[PDB]
Design a protein around this ligand. Structure first.
Ligand SMILES: *[C@@H]1O[C@H](CO)[C@@H](O[C@@H]2O[C@H](CO)[C@@H](O)[C@H](O)[C@H]2NC(C)=O)[C@H](O)[C@H]1NC(C)=O
Ligand SMILES: *[C@@H]1O[C@H](CO)[C@@H](O[C@@H]2O[C@H](CO)[C@@H](O)[C@H](O)[C@H]2NC(C)=O)[C@H](O)[C@H]1NC(C)=O
Ligand SMILES: *[C@@H]1O[C@H](CO)[C@@H](O[C@@H]2O[C@H](CO)[C@@H](O)[C@H](O)[C@H]2NC(C)=O)[C@H](O)[C@H]1NC(C)=O
Ligand SMILES: *[C@@H]1O[C@H](CO)[C@@H](O[C@@H]2O[C@H](CO)[C@@H](O)[C@H](O)[C@H]2NC(C)=O)[C@H](O)[C@H]1NC(C)=O
Ligand code: NAG
Ligand code: NAG
Ligand code: NAG
Ligand code: NAG
Lengths: 142, 162, 103, 49, 49
């Protein structure tokens, strides 16, 4: 948005390469679990990966295996409602819109200050010069 | 040459924040857009005076036709030969482009790392058989230098009339 | 640090602090074939702590973080239900240690 | 602009602060996402139970 | 480098603070002992402010 001495630099990581990391993390947890937060890559079938994760919260792993069909259905439906809860809401991303609306708004009120006298005869610089003389112009300019 | 539609009593346009955009010349009633002359910073890319003295120059979001000329998404890069590889490098430029010195200065598109397709099968596991001890550091600043500044000795500096 | 934490040591610095984090990186992994449970004598067997691992012919129970294979007994598995609800269960003999003393 | 230079180095500080946080916004995105050195991929067969 | 940047910023702010004492700011001279030495009080009071 180059208007008057203002520049908007581009981010170093394009949105295509950011989206390559998040697919690198998603493809990581669903094929190994936590083993990439601690070194190399170790496979694990997703059925037993979740059996480790019921042990973490204190439920014996025989609960998962005997109820894997129910758990898969409950998980699949839970994701189904996530897209509905955001693609049709008012603003679920109100945190992110506030960041955008503050950088732009705080920049417009920087530009709008270019049209204020501050006590000079005129707000435009090239008109003080064309209708006055040097020696007392500097008092207006300052 | 503009595309706007002036009502036949309006002279000039101002879209947002009262910046004039389209002024109709009073001789052919045609609307002419106005865009400011291109500007932007100039960044000097160096590989360090020790290694070499060649330098590239980047013009911030300036179209190359308005100035080894490579048109990046971040501006015009002059002096850097755009190669068709990808390396994890030192000097970041923008829009996923970085430059480095390897007898010349050249530009890339950053590579995010190696490609792994984990051998995932629904009845196989991979269990370690050994281990390593790893010791690493972590630097954290805890405090900065104390400072006290006397206002009157700064502003005036021993002058009662001031 | 990166890895499984063991301990850390502090060092001073001119205007800061420096930590030396001692961790694990498990290394030299070898892949096997697994099974969630084992059906012996018409009931499902789950590992108390660890996983069922096969070298190709035999089945063992190992820790999940270091390969130390052990014979499958009733001292390191707990039974739960019949071998019909689990999907992926396999067939093997659970070495009961009480019988050889009695026999 | 001849009068502006009489204010010493007020222009340099303002350009250094804005360039001081233009860098961070590139460091923030690095610390968050760039936590894997290796780009893993899902297998062509997706059978996660 | 993390501990170095702290020193490289604090000693840099002070240097720009001191370098700001040698600017006219729109007076005759940047030294305070010269305006007082060559103007009468009722007009030097204007330049001091
Ligand atoms: C203002 O003056 C110019 C000429 O000085 C006019 O342009 C002419 O317009 C007629 C009719 O469209 C054309 O036939 C001529 O070829 C044009 N001559 C030139 C040199 O351009 C213009 O129309 C006038 N416009 C107004 C509002 O008076
Ligand atoms: C685990 O890794 C270490 C090395 O980090 C191995 O230690 C080496 O073992 C051989 C003989 O067994 C020695 O010749 C070497 O001096 C040891 N050190 C190095 C750096 O090679 C160790 O053998 C491995 N243990 C297992 C079970 O594989
Ligand atoms: C896995 O590989 C082979 C598979 O045969 C195992 O070798 C046999 O294992 C059984 C019990 O483990 C022994 O009774 C046999 O004497 C072995 N026979 C031969 C020809 O090797 C081997 O034991 C297993 N590996 C480990 C580390 O246990
Ligand atoms: C595991 O062992 C049991 C017993 O040998 C097997 O159960 C048999 O399955 C077949 C096919 O459905 C039936 O005809 C038999 O009636 C079952 N026998 C008993 C005692 O229930 C089972 O098939 C074996 N599974 C594998 C992979 O070997
Ligand atoms: C401006 O840049 C684009 C590509 O970056 C190019 O298509 C276009 O020709 C340039 N504009 C002019 C007037 O050269
Ligand atoms: C990079 O540009 C095209 C895209 O594939 C390719 O054909 C060409 O060989 C590459 N150019 C260089 C100088 O490597
Ligand atoms: C299993 O063995 C090695 C580990 O030594 C691993 O790199 C390889 O990708 C695995 N092979 C298959 C077919 O899963
Ligand atoms: C694993 O995959 C194969 C084919 O995709 C399937 O026959 C089998 O039932 C799956 N589950 C196992 C071995 O537990």
């Amino acid at each position: 948005q180059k208007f008057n001495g203002l520049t908007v630099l581009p981010p170093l990581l394009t949105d295509e390469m950011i989206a390559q990391y998040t697919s690198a993390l998603l493809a990581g947890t669903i094929t190994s679990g936590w083993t990439f937060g601690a070194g190399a890559a170790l496979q694990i079938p997703f059925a037993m990966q979740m059996a480790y994760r019921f042990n973490g919260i204190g439920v014996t792993q025989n609960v998962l295996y005997e109820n894997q069909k129910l758990i898969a259905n409950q998980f699949n439906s839970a994701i189904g409602k996530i897209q509905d809860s955001l693609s049709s809401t008012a603003s679920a991303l109100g945190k992110l819109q506030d960041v955008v609306n503050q950088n732009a708004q705080a920049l417009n009120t920087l530009v709008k200050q270019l049209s204020s006298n501050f006590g000079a005869i005129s707000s435009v610089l090239n008109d003080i010069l064309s209708r006055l003389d040097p020696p007392e112009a500097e008092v207006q300019i300052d | 040459e503009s595309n706007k539609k002036f009502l036949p009593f309006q002279q000039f346009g101002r879209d947002i924040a009262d910046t004039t955009d389209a002024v109709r010349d009073p001789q052919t009633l045609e609307i002419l857009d106005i865009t400011p002359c291109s500007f932007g910073g100039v960044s000097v890319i160096t590989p360090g005076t020790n290694t070499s003295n060649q330098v590239a120059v980047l013009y911030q979001d300036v179209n190359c036709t308005e100035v080894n000329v490579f048109q990046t998404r971040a501006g015009c890069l002059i002096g850097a030969e755009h190669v068709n590889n990808s390396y994890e490098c030192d000097i970041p430029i923008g829009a996923g482009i970085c430059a480095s010195y390897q007898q010349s200065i050249i530009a890339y598109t950053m590579s995010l790392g190696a490609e792994n397709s984990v051998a995932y099968s629904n009845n196989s596991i991979a269990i370690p058989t050994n281990f390593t001890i790893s010791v690493t550091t972590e630097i954290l600043p805890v405090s900065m230098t104390k400072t006290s500044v006397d206002c009157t000795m700064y502003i005036c500096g021993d002058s009662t009339e001031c | 640090g990166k890895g499984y934490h063991l301990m850390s040591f502090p060092q001073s610095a001119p205007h800061g602090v420096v930590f030396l984090h001692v961790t694990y990186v498990p290394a030299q992994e070898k892949n096997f074939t697994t099974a969630p449970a084992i059906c012996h004598d018409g009931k499902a067997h789950f590992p108390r702590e660890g996983v069922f691992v096969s070298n190709g012919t035999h089945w063992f129970v190992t820790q999940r973080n270091f390969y130390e294979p052990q014979i499958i007994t009733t001292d390191n598995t707990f039974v739960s239900g019949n071998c019909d609800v689990v999907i992926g269960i396999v067939n093997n003999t659970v070495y009961d240690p009480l019988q050889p003393e009695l026999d | 602009s001849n009068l502006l230079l009489q204010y010493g180095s007020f222009c340099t500080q303002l350009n250094r602060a804005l360039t001081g946080i233009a860098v961070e916004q590139d460091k923030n995105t690095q610390e968050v996402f760039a936590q894997v050195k290796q780009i893993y991929k899902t297998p062509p067969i997706k059978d996660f139970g």
